[PDB]
């Protein structure tokens, strides 16, 4: 995958955002931007040129499941990879994420190795 792929990391906790950014840096991806909730993510995504979205689930104003559904119904970015980050594997949430078109989901806290496997699986599936 293009190492300069532009990432949008979304989470309402700045600490979680910094963690994800460093993990991506550990994997060789440095073109990363941040957002604090779904609304703020839709606003930044407007600037264009994003290649991957890693999004938290629980956030105020607009949560991750709604951000996902919005990215997927938007013709200009409908195919954008979206990895869902959740605090617990729970049937209702996994199904919801899959059925709404999530590229994958990962349970926090996660390691750099788990993130790499998740990213690689998505890259393979999408032909990146």
């Amino acid at each position: 995958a293009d190492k300069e792929l532009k990432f949008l990391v979304v989470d309402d906790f700045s600490t979680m955002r910094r963690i994800v950014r460093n993990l991506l840096k550990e994997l060789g991806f440095n073109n990363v931007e941040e957002a604090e909730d779904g609304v703020d993510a839709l606003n930044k995504l407007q600037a264009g040129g994003y290649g991957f979205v890693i999004s938290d689930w629980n956030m105020p104003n607009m949560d991750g499941l709604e951000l996902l559904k919005t990215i997927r119904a938007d013709g200009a970015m409908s195919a954008l990879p979206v990895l869902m980050v959740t605090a617990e594997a729970k049937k209702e949430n996994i199904i919801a994420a899959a059925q709404a078109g999530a590229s994958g989901y990962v349970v926090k806290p996660f390691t750099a190795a788990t993130l790499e496997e998740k990213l690689n699986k998505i890259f393979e599936k999408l032909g990146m």
Binding site: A89, K90, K91, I94, I95, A98, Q99, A102, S103, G104, Y105, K121
Partner: protein
């Protein structure tokens, strides 16, 4: 009841997909082969829902559902 069959699994997927299926339901009559996995499903989850979750990892043509 119904039976699910997973084929052409790569190393580690048999265990990983048993676990994923575990989060969505309770499997009976589990058969773990070298690159395959089959089991009987209670019927407490739509199959399309299983497929969508399993497709996070594998392809749709690797999943088969059938009446036992």
């Amino acid at each position: 009841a119904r039976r699910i069959i997973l084929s052409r699994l790569k190393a580690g997927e048999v265990d990983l997909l048993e676990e994923e299926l575990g989060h969505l339901t309770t499997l009976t009559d589990v058969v773990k082969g070298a690159d395959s996995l089959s089991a009987i499903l209670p019927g407490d989850i739509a199959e399309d829902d299983i497929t969508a979750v399993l497709c996070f990892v594998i392809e749709a043509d690797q999943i088969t559902f059938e009446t036992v």
